[PDB]
Curated annotation (Swiss-Prot):
One of its GO terms (cellular component) is protein-containing complex. Changing G93S: In MRXS35; uncertain significance. This is Large ribosomal subunit protein uL16. It comes from Homo sapiens (Human). It comes from the Eukaryota. It is linked to Autism, X-linked 5: A complex multifactorial, pervasive developmental disorder characterized by impairments in reciprocal social interaction and communication, restricted and stereotyped patterns of interests and activities, and the presence of developmental abnormalities by 3 years of age. Most individuals with autism also manifest moderate intellectual disability. Its main location: cytoplasm. One of its GO terms (biological process) is cytoplasmic translation. Changing K39E: In MRXS35; loss of function; fails to rescue embryonic brain development when expressed in a zebrafish heterologous system.
């Protein structure tokens, strides 16, 4: 089950570049974001996930496409921003950070 009720604040690393991202860069970024989150919110104070596939491998990203998402308690908003802001260093091109109560999903 997804802790949507307990971790209502969502942070999203939104791509602003079209490009291929290696499994190594994506994992690096997840490590980075995870590390800061555990020491800032507690190993169980959040949920993190890479929204790209295949996840060596290579994954494609489009402009405006979510790369990574974190959910936690409203009080940790600032830590999420810092987690995503650091992690975006493992990826070339430009990335943006979006905060909301929605996790988002692919739709047609
Ligand atoms: K970057």
């Amino acid at each position: 089950k997804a802790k949507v009720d307990e971790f209502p604040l969502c942070g999203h690393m939104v791509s602003d570049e079209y490009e291929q991202l290696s499994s190594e860069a994506l994992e690096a970024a997840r490590i980075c974001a995870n590390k800061y989150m555990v020491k800032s919110c507690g190993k169980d104070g959040f949920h993190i996930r890479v929204r790209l596939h295949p996840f060596g491998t290579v994954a494609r990203v489009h402009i405006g496409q979510v790369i990574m998402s974190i959910r936690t308690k409203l009080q940790n908003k600032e830590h999420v921003i810092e987690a995503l802001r650091r992690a975006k260093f493992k990826f070339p091109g430009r990335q943006k950070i979006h905060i909301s109560k929605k996790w988002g999903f692919t739709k047609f």
